[PDB]
Design a protein around this nucleic acid. Structure first.
Ligand SMILES: [Mg+2]
Ligand SMILES: [Mg+2]
Ligand SMILES: [Mg+2]
Ligand SMILES: [Mg+2]
Ligand SMILES: [Mg+2]
Ligand SMILES: [Mg+2]
Ligand SMILES: [Mg+2]
Ligand SMILES: [Mg+2]
Ligand SMILES: [Mg+2]
Ligand SMILES: [Mg+2]
Ligand SMILES: [Mg+2]
Ligand SMILES: [Mg+2]
Ligand SMILES: [Mg+2]
Ligand SMILES: [Mg+2]
Ligand SMILES: [Mg+2]
Ligand SMILES: [Mg+2]
Ligand SMILES: [Mg+2]
Ligand SMILES: [Mg+2]
Ligand SMILES: [Mg+2]
Lengths: 49, 129, 62, 106, 62
RNA sequence: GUACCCAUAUCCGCAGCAGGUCUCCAAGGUGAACAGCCUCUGGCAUGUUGGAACAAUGUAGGUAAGGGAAGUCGGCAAGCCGGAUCCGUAACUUCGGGAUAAGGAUUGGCUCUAAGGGCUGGCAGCCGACUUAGAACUGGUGCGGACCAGGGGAAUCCGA
RNA sequence: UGGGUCGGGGUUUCGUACGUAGCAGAGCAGCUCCCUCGCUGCGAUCUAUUGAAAGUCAGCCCUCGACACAAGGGUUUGUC
């Protein structure tokens, strides 16, 4: 989903410096991934194999 | 600098004239510093200079083109802090080419964008935002 | 910074609601379009039941 | 338990959510028939005239949301049908709907 | 099983409309044997063919 | 001569064709009303088929923040007012009109008050229609709450 | 630690349900212990029950509360 957030900025020389802003922010769930396989690739004059 | 605020005043808008020059309404005829698209009306926002004429007001100010700065709009524009705000009516002031006010004092509130872009308009300091 | 709504009296968190700057100079904060329309159509917050003003005037909770 | 009879609370507001005004009650009755097909399993389903009245009690485009019905799976005894089992769906009236679960009756 | 003749004839006997004639659904085979106005009158006197009352049109609110 | 249809299916139109064809009877509520809308007596299966889904395009219908004709040959279409009561109604004119000119205020619900009649006897007693005006109370300024329904003004050309 | 249907919560939308009671109600009608807010009934609204009632997935979230169901079916497919 998406939830906005309030965050302090560090941009110097702008009308936003040292001010708070609300910006759109998306969230992704990324659980740990289980490793199963290993694949090898050789560089052939026609591409990868 | 100035950010992309919601443009709510296209060419042909009849806004109020919030100053003591003697003009009641201003008729937006174009927008300064804009590049057009095929069949697209040049829109104006807050703090951006435009060319305008006086439809109703003093006969000496009527029937002539002069620069103007929009100070209040009814189209809700998003502030960078993360809030939306909009005024009661579309209103602007008249200025010269350099960016100096023609009238002495202003009336009604003035948006923060225009107040920070044009220092001479904020010099009157009627009401900010 | 969390401001109280002018009509409903609830807390308006950053990124929600709108603001309304009257020609006089008053700046009101509206939580949503319901309260916005209720304020623009001149409805009494004390007469509207679900607002905090009605509860404070009728001593509902405390 | 081949002739057992039970009671259910079918939610028509969920099943006619997107049909349109002129086709709410017929689709509701088709959904009741499909619910009987899914619960009992007999391809022959007969609904009661009282249930038809209870469904059509508020017109076509205004169908009651929850309906408490009773399903009874009975043998046919007609020797012209392959299934030989039919589900009779009757309508029982109730005032409230909270805390009502599906129970079997004798 | 064709009761069109009986439905048409009982209306003319009772001097009412075709919608006000009520037939006994269980005695359909007995109604089908009727083919005369005398038979229709006998069945009406028996009770298989009756006249339904006029739909209510209340004037209390008026 | 006497049946029957007399019709979005018995007539004509090459047909069970949104076309055409002369008459009588015609209720209740709202409403000024045979307007529009809702019911009763009386008819009907939605007009030469149904099931499933709600893609583009299309045919009818309704809204949209800010601007309000800046689109278009053209305000085309669409949109505003639209009824009733009370004030006020211009230029011109053939003095009849313009005129519902234009421009304003009100409109609900429930309790009330006052006025507007007839008949019997030598000023009194009873009987029944809905109209008007005013005031009080009250509903989240909503009140022609659906339906019904005049945008207006300034001028030119022509035709009374 | 199967999915499904109800039900229970969370969230949410509207805005405070019927009934009841009131020494709240512009007032009206009947009655008399002639009545020091006299009694009864009617009476737009208003107050307490009441952040109440109502809907909430059919493309919302959680459940191991309750019911039934399940390895049940048809067609086709090999490289001396
Ligand atoms: Mg059969
Ligand atoms: Mg004849
Ligand atoms: Mg025809
Ligand atoms: Mg015709
Ligand atoms: Mg009438
Ligand atoms: Mg009348
Ligand atoms: Mg059909
Ligand atoms: Mg036809
Ligand atoms: Mg718009
Ligand atoms: Mg708008
Ligand atoms: Mg305008
Ligand atoms: Mg113009
Ligand atoms: Mg042209
Ligand atoms: Mg037109
Ligand atoms: Mg003139
Ligand atoms: Mg005129
Ligand atoms: Mg009186
Ligand atoms: Mg002519
Ligand atoms: Mg209700």
């Amino acid at each position: 989903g998406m939830t906005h957030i309030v965050r302090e900025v560090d941009r110097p020389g702008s009308k936003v410096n040292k001010k708070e802003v609300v910006e759109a922010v998306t969230i992704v769930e990324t659980p740990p991934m289980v490793v199963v396989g290993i694949v090898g690739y050789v560089e052939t004059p026609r591409g990868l194999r | 600098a100035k950010f992309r605020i919601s443009l709510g005043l296209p060419v042909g808008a009849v806004i109020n004239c919030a100053d003591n020059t003697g003009a009641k309404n201003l008729y937006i005829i174009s927008v300064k510093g804009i590049k057009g698209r095929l069949n697209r009306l040049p829109a104006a926002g807050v703090g951006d200079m435009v060319m305008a004429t006086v439809k109703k007001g003093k006969p000496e100010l009527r029937k002539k083109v002069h620069p103007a700065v929009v100070i209040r709009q009814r189209k809700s524009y998003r502030r960078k802090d993360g809030v939306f705000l909009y005024f009661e009516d579309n209103a602007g002031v008249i200025v010269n080419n350099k960016g100096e006010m023609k009238g002495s004092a202003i009336t009604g509130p003035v948006a923060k964008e225009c107040a920070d872009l044009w220092p001479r308009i904020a010099s009157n300091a009627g009401s900010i935002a | 910074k969390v401001e109280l709504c002018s009509f409903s009296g609830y807390k308006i968190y950053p990124g929600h609601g709108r603001r309304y700057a009257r020609t006089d100079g008053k700046v009101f904060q509206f939580l949503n379009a319901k309260c916005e329309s209720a304020f623009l159509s001149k409805r009494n917050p004390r007469q509207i039941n679900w607002t905090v003003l009605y509860r404070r005037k009728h001593k509902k909770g405390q | 338990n081949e002739v057992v009879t039970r009671e259910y609370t079918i939610n028509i507001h969920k099943r006619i959510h997107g049909v349109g005004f002129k086709k709410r009650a017929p689709r509701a009755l088709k959904e009741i028939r499909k619910f009987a097909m899914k619960e009992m399993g007999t391809p022959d389903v007969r609904i009661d005239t009282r249930l038809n009245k209870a469904v059509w009690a508020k017109g076509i485009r205004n169908v009651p949301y929850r309906i408490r019905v009773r399903l009874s799976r009975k043998r046919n005894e007609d020797e012209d049908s392959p299934n030989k089992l039919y589900t009779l769906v009757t309508y029982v009236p109730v005032t409230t709907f909270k805390n009502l679960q599906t129970v079997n009756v004798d | 099983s064709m009761l069109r003749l009986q439905k048409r004839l009982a209306s003319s006997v009772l001097r009412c409309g075709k919608k006000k004639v009520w037939l006994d659904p269980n005695e359909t085979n007995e109604i089908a044997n009727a083919n005369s106005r005398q038979q229709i009158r006998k069945l009406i006197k028996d009770g298989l063919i009756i006249r339904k009352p006029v739909t209510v049109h209340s004037r209390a609110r008026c």
